[PDB]
């Protein structure tokens, strides 16, 4: 994936997260937990769903056409009738092959871009009160309790409240 998050700097996925495409796991004074990010997950799904709907709600009506199976041998005219159909068929098969190939590649990179977006979003919230350990984890340098962790997940966290405490722990 272009962003190197999924199957990248984030070693592996969680089979345990059954409530979303994205989330956090934390270990604090009070314990260890796991929520799933709705906003993030919903954004991946809405994009892949619109992406899907463009490809499957479409068919074209064709009634009387040319024949395609012959009971006897004829020659010139019949050859043309077959070439035509055979030609048409190969070109759509190519279109189909290419369609998914392209689509799938953009689909894998989009899920990667969404994971990364949540990470940068999170890092920007923490400011100077935390550091990116490189395994997809932020080491928050202050006591961040279940309430503090919730304020980060629902996006309410105030870096100013724990700033001093953190810098003390960071640059010591």
Partner 1 sequence: STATLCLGHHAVPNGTIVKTITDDQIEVTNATELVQSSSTGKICNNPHRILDGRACTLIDALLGDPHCDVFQNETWDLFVERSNAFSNCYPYDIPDYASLRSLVASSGTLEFITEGFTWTGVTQNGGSSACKRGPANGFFSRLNWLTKSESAYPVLNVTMPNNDNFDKLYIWGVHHPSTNQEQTNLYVQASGRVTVSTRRSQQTIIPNIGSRPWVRGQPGRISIYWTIVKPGDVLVINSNGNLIAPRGYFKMRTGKSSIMRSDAPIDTCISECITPNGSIPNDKPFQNVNKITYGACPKYVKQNTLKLATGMRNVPEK
Ligand X SMILES: *[C@@H]1O[C@H](CO)[C@@H](O)[C@H](O)[C@H]1NC(C)=O
**Cβ contacts of 34-41, under 8 Å, gap ≥ 24:** 35/153, 37/118, 37/153, 40/114, 40/115, 40/117, 40/118
Residue length, the chain? 172
Q: Is 60 near a copy of itself (CB under 8 A)?
A: yes
- For the chain, the first-to-last Cα distance in angstroms comes to 38
Q: Residue 76 CB, nearest distance to a copy of itself (Å)?
A: 7
Map the footprint of a copy of itself across residues 15-44, applying CB under 8 A: none
Site for partner 1 in 52-91 (CB under 8 A): 52-56, 58-65, 67-69, 72-77, 79, 85, 89-90
| Three-point CA angle 65, 66, 71, nearest 5° | 140
Q: Considering the complex, what minimum distance in angstroms separates the CB of residue 98 from a copy of itself? A: 7
Task: Please state the closest distance from residue 172 (CB atom) to ligand X, in A.
Answer: 27
Helix or strand or coil: residue 134? Answer: coil
The footprint of ligand X on residues 21-60 (CB under 6 A) is 52
**Distance in Å, CB of 54 to ligand X, minimum:** 12
38, interface contact from a copy of itself, partner 1, ligand X, none, CB < 5-8 Å by kind: none
| 8 Å CB contact between 116 and 132 | no
Q: Is 151 an interacting residue with respect to ligand X (CB under 6 A)?
A: yes
Nearest to 21 by CA among 1, 42, 2: 42
Binder to a copy of itself among 42, 46, 70, 88 (CB under 8 A)?
88
């Amino acid at each position: 994936g272009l962003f190197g998050a999924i199957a990248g700097f984030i070693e592996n996925g969680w089979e345990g997260m059954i409530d979303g495409w994205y989330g956090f796991r934390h270990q604090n004074s009070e314990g260890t937990g796991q929520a799933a990010d709705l906003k993030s997950t919903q954004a991946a799904i809405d994009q892949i769903n619109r992406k899907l709907n463009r490809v499957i709600e479409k068919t074209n009506e064709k009634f009387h056409q040319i024949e395609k199976e012959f009971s006897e041998v004829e020659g010139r005219i019949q050859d043309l009738e077959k070439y035509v159909e055979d030609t048409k068929i190969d070109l759509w098969s190519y279109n189909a092959e290419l369609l998914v190939a392209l689509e799938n590649q953009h689909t894998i990179d989009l899920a990667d871009s969404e994971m990364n977006k949540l990470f940068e979003k999170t890092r920007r919230q923490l400011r100077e009160n935390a550091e990116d350990m490189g395994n997809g984890c932020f080491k928050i340098y202050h006591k961040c309790d279940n309430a503090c962790i919730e304020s980060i997940r629902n996006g309410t966290y105030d870096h100013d409240i724990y700033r001093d405490e953190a810098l003390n722990n960071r640059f010591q």
